[PDB]
Ligand binder design. Structure first.
Ligand code: LYS
Ligand code: LYS
Ligand code: MG
Lengths: 296, 295
C-alpha cells in the first residue's frame, strides 16, 4: 500500500476579521516544514473543518499543497463528512487539487452502524486513487469504528491504509496491530503519542505540533528509530502542555497558545467556537512559560 | 408564542435515491388525519444530515403547504454545528412559512457553554418565529446545561423551550423547577409520559410515524391531566418504543414503516443502511402487537 506516516500536524486555521488569513496559514505551514514535520493535515478538526465553507476548505487545501511543493512534506487533506455523498465529493476535490491523501473522520451525529461505516468508507475509497486514513474519535462522533470494521476496510480497499485513533483506548491499538500488523496506526492524542508509537504505530497527527513542531517531530523520529527512551522522555516533558491544550475543546486552547506566542495575530474563532474562559486563558499561559516555542 | 403538543419527527422516504415527494406529502396527511398537532420536517428522524440544503427546503415546503388550511403547525428542523449555517437555515424556514424551528445543539466541534449561548442568541436574534432548543448529547458530544437553556429562555423572546433527548429525568426536574414557564418537549418516546407528568407540554415523536393516533392520545390525555390513561398508553407503547432504537434512529422506524406498507421501499442515504437481519425480524415481531392505521 501507499502510505502517509510520521510526524504530522493538524493545522489551525487563523482568522483575521472573520476571514481566513491566507498569508498566515501559508506562513504557519512553512514553519512546520522547517521544523521536521513529515505531513500537514489541512481543514481537520483542529482546523475548524465544521465551520469552514466548502470554498474556504478548498483554499486551505490549495495553500497547503502549494506550500509543500518542492519539499518532502506531504498534504493529508481533511475530507470527512457524516454524509457519504458529501465525503466522496470532498475526497474527489482534494485529490484533484494536489493533496497526497485524505483524512476522513467517522460520521458524526447520525451514528451509523458498523455496516454503514463499512459502506461509507468503501464508497470514499472507491472515490479516489490516493491513500485514505480513517479517523476514529468517538467522543465527538457518537460512534466507534470497531477493529473488525477497520481490518475489513484495510483488506477490501487498496486506499485504506490505517487509522488515526483519538479514543484514549490503548487496548484497541493492541487489538488492531495484533490482528492486522500491516496497517498504519496513527496517534490522534498527543499525551499518549509515545505509547501508541511504542506498540507499532507509524506516526502522529498532533495538536501540540502547532506550537512545538520540533518536539513532536523529534518524539516521532526517535520512536521510529526505535529509540524509545528518547521518545518517552519527550513524551513525558510534553504531558503538561498536551493536557492543558484541552482545558477547553480543541482548538480553543491551541489557538490561544499560538496567539500568546505571537504566532498568529488575533484570537479569532468561528461560532459556536469562542475564546476560552479567563481561568483557562491564564492557565494556558502558565504552562506555556515552561516550554521553548520556536518562531518563524 | 409557542408550538407544543403531539408532534411527529417525519421520516424522509426515498425512491431511487431521491426524495419521494408524493409519499412525503401522503405521510404528512396521515399524521394530520390522526390527531397530530405539529410535524417536524427534516429533523434527526428525517435524515437531515444527509439531505442537501435544496432537499431540506423541499420537505419544509411540502410540510407547510400540506398543513396550510389546517391547525397543524410546522416545526422545521434548522440546526447546524456552524452558527452561520444555522442562522441561514433559520432564515429560510421563516421565509418559507414554517411556524418555528428546531435547532439541534452543535455536534462534533463541542462548543463551550458560552459558545452555545452565543450560537443560539445569533439564531434567535435573526428571525422572529419561535425557536425550540434540541439537546441530544449522545449524538452531538455536548450538553446544553440547565443554566444555559434557562439563560437563553430569559434573554431571547423567540426561545421558548427545549426538546430533551438525554434520558435524564433529573435534568427535566432541574429545568421546570427553576424555569416553570418554558416548554419542555420530550425527545424520547419511551419516557413520554414521565416527561409530560412533570409539566412537559408535548412530544416530538419517532413512534408517531407508525402509530400517530396512539402518540396523539397519550399526549392529549396527559395535557388534560388524565395521567392514568396517558401512562396506560405509554406502558402499552414501551415494546415498540424500545425496539425502534435497536439500531440508531431512523433505521428501525423506516424498517417498521416499510414492513407495515406505509412506504414502498427500504431506502436510506449512506452512511445509514438497512438493519441487521436479526433486528429486522425483532422489529417485525414487536409490530404484531399493535394496530397500525393505514391511509
Ligand atoms: N458543518 C457541516 C458542513 C461542513 C462543510 C465543510 N466544512 C459539517 O460539519 O458536516
Ligand atoms: N451533513 C452536514 C451538512 C448539513 C446539511 C444538513 N444539516 C451536516 O450535518 O452538518
Ligand atoms: Mg442546576
Amino acid at each position: 500500500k501507499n502510505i502517509i506516516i510520521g510526524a504530522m500536524t493538524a493545522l489551525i486555521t487563523p482568522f483575521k476579521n472573520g476571514k481566513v488569513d491566507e498569508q498566515s496559514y501559508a506562513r504557519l505551514i512553512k514553519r512546520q516544514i522547517e521544523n521536521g514535520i513529515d505531513a500537514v493535515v489541512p481543514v481537520g478538526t483542529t482546523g475548524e473543518s465544521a465551520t469552514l465553507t466548502h470554498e474556504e476548505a478548498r483554499t486551505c487545501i490549495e495553500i497547503a499543497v502549494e506550500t509543500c511543493k518542492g519539499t518532502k512534506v506531504k498534504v493529508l487533506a481533511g475530507a470527512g463528512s457524516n454524509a457519504t455523498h458529501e465525503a466522496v465529493g470532498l475526497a474527489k476535490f482534494a485529490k484533484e487539487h494536489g493533496a497526497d491523501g485524505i483524512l476522513s473522520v467517522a460520521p458524526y451525529y447520525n451514528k451509523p452502524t458498523q455496516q454503514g461505516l463499512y459502506e461509507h468508507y468503501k464508497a470514499i475509497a472507491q472515490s479516489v486513487d490516493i491513500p485514505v486514513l480513517l479517523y476514529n474519535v468517538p467522543g465527538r462522533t457518537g460512534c466507534e469504528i470497531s477493529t473488525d470494521t477497520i481490518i475489513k476496510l484495510f483488506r477490501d480497499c487498496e486506499n485504506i491504509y490505517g487509522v488515526k485513533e483519538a479514543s484514549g483506548n490503548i487496548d484497541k491499538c493492541v487489538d488492531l496491530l495484533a490482528h492486522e500488523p500491516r496497517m498504519m496506526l496513527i496517534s490522534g492524542e498527543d499525551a499518549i503519542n509515545y505509547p501508541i508509537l511504542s506498540n507499532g504505530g507509524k506516526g502522529v497527527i498532533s495538536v501540540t505540533s502547532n506550537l512545538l513542531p520540533d518536539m513532536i517531530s523529534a518524539l516521532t523520529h526517535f520512536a521510529l528509530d526505535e529509540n524509545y527512551k528518547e521518545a518517552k522522555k519527550i513524551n513525558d516533558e510534553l504531558y503538561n502542555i498536551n493536557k492543558i491544550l484541552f482545558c477547553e475543546s480543541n482548538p480553543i486552547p491551541i489557538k490561544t497558545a499560538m496567539y500568546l506566542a505571537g504566532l498568529i495575530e488575533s484570537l479569532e474563532f468561528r461560532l459556536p467556537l469562542c475564546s476560552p474562559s479567563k481561568e483557562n486563558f491564564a492557565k494556558i499561559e502558565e504552562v506555556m512559560k515552561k516550554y521553548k516555542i520556536k518562531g518563524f
